[PDB]
Design a binder for these strands. Structure first.
Ligand SMILES: [Mg+2]
Ligand SMILES: [Mg+2]
Ligand SMILES: [Mg+2]
Ligand SMILES: [Mg+2]
Ligand SMILES: [Mg+2]
Ligand SMILES: [Mg+2]
Ligand SMILES: [Mg+2]
Ligand SMILES: [Mg+2]
Ligand SMILES: [Mg+2]
Ligand SMILES: [Mg+2]
Ligand SMILES: [Mg+2]
Ligand SMILES: [Mg+2]
Ligand SMILES: [Mg+2]
Ligand SMILES: [Mg+2]
Ligand SMILES: [Mg+2]
Ligand SMILES: [Mg+2]
Ligand SMILES: [Mg+2]
Ligand SMILES: [Mg+2]
Ligand SMILES: [Mg+2]
Ligand SMILES: [Mg+2]
Ligand SMILES: [Mg+2]
Ligand SMILES: [Mg+2]
Ligand SMILES: [Mg+2]
Ligand SMILES: [Mg+2]
Ligand SMILES: [Mg+2]
Ligand SMILES: [Mg+2]
Ligand SMILES: [Mg+2]
Ligand SMILES: [Mg+2]
Ligand SMILES: [Mg+2]
Ligand SMILES: [Mg+2]
Ligand SMILES: [Mg+2]
Ligand SMILES: [Mg+2]
Ligand SMILES: [Mg+2]
Lengths: 85, 205, 82, 80
RNA sequence: AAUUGAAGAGUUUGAUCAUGGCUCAGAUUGAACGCUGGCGGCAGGCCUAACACAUGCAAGUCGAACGGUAACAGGAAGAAGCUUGCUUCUUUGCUGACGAGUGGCGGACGGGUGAGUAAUGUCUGGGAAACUGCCUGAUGGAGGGGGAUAACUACUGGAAACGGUAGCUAAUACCGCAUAACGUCGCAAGACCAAAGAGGGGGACCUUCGGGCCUCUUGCCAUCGGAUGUGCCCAGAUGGGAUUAGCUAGUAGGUGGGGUAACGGCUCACCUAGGCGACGAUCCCUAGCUGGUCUGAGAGGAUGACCAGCCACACUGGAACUGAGACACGGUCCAGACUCCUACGGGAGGCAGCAGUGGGGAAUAUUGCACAAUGGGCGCAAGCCUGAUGCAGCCAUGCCGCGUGUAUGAAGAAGGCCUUCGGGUUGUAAAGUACUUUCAGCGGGGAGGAAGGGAGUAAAGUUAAUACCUUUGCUCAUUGACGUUACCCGCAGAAGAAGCACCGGCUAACUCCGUGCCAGCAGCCGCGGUAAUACGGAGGGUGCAAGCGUUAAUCGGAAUUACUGGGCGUAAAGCGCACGCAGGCGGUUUGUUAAGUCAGAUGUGAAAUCCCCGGGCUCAACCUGGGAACUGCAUCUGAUACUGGCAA
């Protein structure tokens, strides 16, 4: 409403869409992992982890999941896979 | 704020000279003092303890010409201070400037001594203090302003000032018209015919 | 960031500041961390008029506090050692 | 220990869901008489070991559950 | 030195003592009304409809991130106004600057309110599992690429709000790629993550004359700290009611998955069958909590404006997005209620920010001035913004100060009032006489609130450097909204400046006339039917004074909810009687324990307030230094007589 930082409104949408896509693509690669664990495939399970690890670590750096959120995911996944891998 | 009313009337009701026409003549008469403060003054005021208690403080008040509000605060300040509340009360009352101007003789009656104060015709430790209630402290030095010195009033003022018993706690010139509040008057100075503990009682309940 | 500044506990037309260390975001006379001096600008030439526990001010500026503009003057106006 | 609490058991009958009674006396803030103000606490005890009637020593840990912020330390006495 | 402070009266009776309510003297108020109303200082000012709101203003700023020129300012190869140095337009963004746009940081602060909330709250004291913008310590980073896009241009739809196509372009927007440890996962081996430039001045040397290069500044990335802010957990305390006694299925716990910055039924799946409750759950009613405020000798009682802390809310219900921080006070989205605009197709808005308006009410202010100060946002800065704030205006609403005159003035006038007519009274009061001029009026002069910033210059820190930059001096020209400021001097003339309640007793103050159980009074008793100190008027008096009365309201006196500090034979009060669960209490001895109790130490108990001693405004109110106090809570160590526990 009439006050300069209308700008801010339209700004936070540009932001919102940006983060929306990277935020999904990320949880996809995360999904691909839990998929293999439910399957049984230890290799695809590691294969999945090794391609998602960078993009999590990476997203965090960029700052839509800042720090430990990544950690937990790695930690969790790692346990799971070699729980029976 | 000032009483302003026919002032002998007071002394008459209060039964004693409050020195409010102070000026020339003494031991009143040439007035009527006593046996008819009104239209039934003639009558015997056989009166309650409350009344004798009431009239005492009234007397003290009509004397320094202080209105209820201020007097109360005097009492309260008196009581706050350690020492006999009633003495402390009497102390504060005397500490009044206007009073310590009439008392140094520069003014006929306290009323007059006051008009002087309010008319910026006085100076404590050099500086002009025109408020009647300016409390004065030991070693203080109240003078008359050079402007309007030895002018009318202030002569006869410093005159019969010597007719009076005359202080002790204050030394005072008469040529310069300066003078020094040397100490806080003691109980034994002033008084006799005033009864603190009554007007402590009036304000105790 | 924390800051050293003047709170104005004066009194219409005769200001008298407290000097305080506080979260710069708070109100000029609000919540503070500790008091570290005072500054009467009507001091009068008589006696006092700008007492100022330096060795604390010190401490906080060590811990990262910024100083006002006025306060900065006062410190460089207290002189410092004499 | 940074402080410890004693208290009797009161309820053992639940997979580690141990609850302990604590008893203080306190001066009534108004009529000065001393009364019993009791406190119950939900304490953890891995591999269930205390029993109804046991005196027990207890300490304040972080949240083990919405309810539990205390584990036990030692036991004392039994068969009340 | 520093809480060292406590009073009673009226009224049941013919009278009495007791019992017991009613009433009164006192403090206090964000008050209202009635009469009256002079000046100033500080303060207070919608208590009601968390009713509804016209209009202005309450959040921006940065060109030293970016492409930039549309406005106005200059300058420019060059075209000119020409009156040959003064200068006009075409243009040219060339730089001073700057609308619009991208980007950055702030719009989570400051300011409003008390609705909801008896606990995601608050107060006290603690705890472990977390994040933390700007500021700050340390250590290294800062390579090399890529595709976009707003603006703008063209075309185009709308009354407006605001859009549709197609191009076109920069960066501190955005994404890969490199690099990757004292970081993250991992027992390890290993694997994996980042970034941005922008200015200022400058010797060679020289370059595509834009700059490289040197140099300092500032921003950018990473990790570990600090500092602060915030999240979370425990215990105790923090209203009322049983004419509410039972409550509970994510309910209580476990195991695992998931989730959060973080512990966690936070969530899920599965298992256990628990969890709360008369030490008052559940239900209902009311309510923001604190510091403190009023009162009281205390203990208490009452209370939560103004100041400060916390919480919570932002038209109503619900949501999330952005972000370090929000589920956002002047942001977004949905639903609702309601209002405005319109060309009828569609749009827009939320004062519990400041002022103001309608409405409600016994009642609560100006649509003001200024960023000068202090404080906040942004900027290297200059500065810009700031209804925070500093001031001003309104109201006796309160506190405090002051004035409205001072002396003199008698047989004491006049008039009024009472009178046994002798006289008394109003009353030194008036008049008259001298004198003073505070305040308001008028005229002169004139502090402080002002630090800083601007240029110069000087030295020092750097560097290639004497440039820049930063720091510290020196001078010079400066910067106040308030403001006709405070305060000071002169001027005139007592000149402009007194009212309200009361006078039967309580309770200070008495007579006359009128009236006649009428008119009327009244806090309580109770006054009024012919001599009314009680009605109404008058004279006189008492009390307070720019106030005075009335009403409303808290506590006090009320030992009248009695903990301190009370009662139940006959005055209010022993259940018609018994038995007994819970609960309370419990003879006597030794040992043990150390919970109650006691002792010490440590920490904490925000600042303001209160109080003691001072200090500053001519005093005071007011302002301020420093103490004292906060009677509390917790931790540790001790003491063992008493109480509690265990034993015999
Ligand atoms: Mg897990
Ligand atoms: Mg007054
Ligand atoms: Mg009788
Ligand atoms: Mg009027
Ligand atoms: Mg611009
Ligand atoms: Mg409410
Ligand atoms: Mg970036
Ligand atoms: Mg990489
Ligand atoms: Mg790059
Ligand atoms: Mg779990
Ligand atoms: Mg009492
Ligand atoms: Mg307010
Ligand atoms: Mg909402
Ligand atoms: Mg977020
Ligand atoms: Mg609003
Ligand atoms: Mg308003
Ligand atoms: Mg009305
Ligand atoms: Mg305001
Ligand atoms: Mg006569
Ligand atoms: Mg004047
Ligand atoms: Mg000045
Ligand atoms: Mg100065
Ligand atoms: Mg009487
Ligand atoms: Mg009357
Ligand atoms: Mg009569
Ligand atoms: Mg009582
Ligand atoms: Mg009794
Ligand atoms: Mg009876
Ligand atoms: Mg019986
Ligand atoms: Mg015994
Ligand atoms: Mg304190
Ligand atoms: Mg003083
Ligand atoms: Mg024993």
């Amino acid at each position: 409403n009439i006050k300069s930082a209308k700008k801010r409104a339209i700004q936070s949408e540009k932001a919102r869409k940006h983060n929306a896509s990277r935020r999904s693509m990320m949880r996809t690669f995360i999904k691909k992992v839990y998929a293999a664990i439910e399957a049984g495939d230890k290799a695809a399970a590691q294969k999945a982890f090794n391609e998602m690890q960078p993009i999590v670590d990476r997203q965090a750096a960029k700052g839509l999941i800042h720090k430990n959120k990544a950690a937990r995911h790695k930690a969790n996944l790692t346990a799971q896979i070699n729980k029976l891998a | 704020a000032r009483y302003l009313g026919p002032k002998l009337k007071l002394s008459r009701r209060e039964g004693t000279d409050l020195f409010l026409k102070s000026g020339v003549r003494a031991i009143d008469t040439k007035c009527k003092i006593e046996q008819a403060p009104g239209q039934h003054g003639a009558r015997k005021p056989r009166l309650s303890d409350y009344g004798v208690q009431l009239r005492e403080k009234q007397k003290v008040r009509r004397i320094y010409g202080v209105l209820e509000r201020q007097f109360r605060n005097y009492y309260k300040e008196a009581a706050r201070l350690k020492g006999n509340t009633g003495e402390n009360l009497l102390a504060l009352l005397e500490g009044r400037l206007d009073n310590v101007v009439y008392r140094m003789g520069f003014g006929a009656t306290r009323a007059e001594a006051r008009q002087l104060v309010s008319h910026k015709a006085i100076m404590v430790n050099g500086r002009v203090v025109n408020i009647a209630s300016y409390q004065v402290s030991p070693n203080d030095v109240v003078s008359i302003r050079e402007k309007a010195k030895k002018q009318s009033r202030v002569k006869a003022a410093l005159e019969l000032a010597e007719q009076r018993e005359k202080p002790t706690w204050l030394e005072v010139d008469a040529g310069k018209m300066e003078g020094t509040f040397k100490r806080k008057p003691e109980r034994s100075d002033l008084s006799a015919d005033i009864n603190e503990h009554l007007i402590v009682e009036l304000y105790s309940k | 960031m924390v800051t050293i500044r003047l709170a104005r506990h004066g009194a219409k037309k005769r200001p008298f500041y407290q000097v305080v260390v506080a979260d710069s975001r708070n109100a000029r006379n609000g919540r503070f961390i500790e008091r570290v001096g005072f500054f009467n600008p009507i001091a009068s030439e008589k006696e006092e008029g700008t007492r100022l526990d330096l060795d604390r001010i010190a401490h906080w500026v060590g811990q990262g506090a910024t100083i006002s503009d006025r306060v900065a003057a006062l410190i460089k106006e207290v002189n410092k050692a004499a | 220990k940074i402080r410890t609490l004693q208290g009797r058991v009161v309820s053992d009958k639940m997979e580690k869901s141990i609850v302990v009674a604590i008893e203080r006396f306190v001066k009534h803030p108004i009529y000065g008489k001393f009364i019993k103000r009791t406190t119950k606490l939900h304490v953890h005890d891995e591999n269930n070991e205390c029993g109804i009637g046991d005196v027990v020593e207890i300490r304040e840990c972080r949240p083990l559950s919405k309810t539990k912020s205390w584990t036990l330390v030692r036991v004392v006495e039994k068969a009340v």
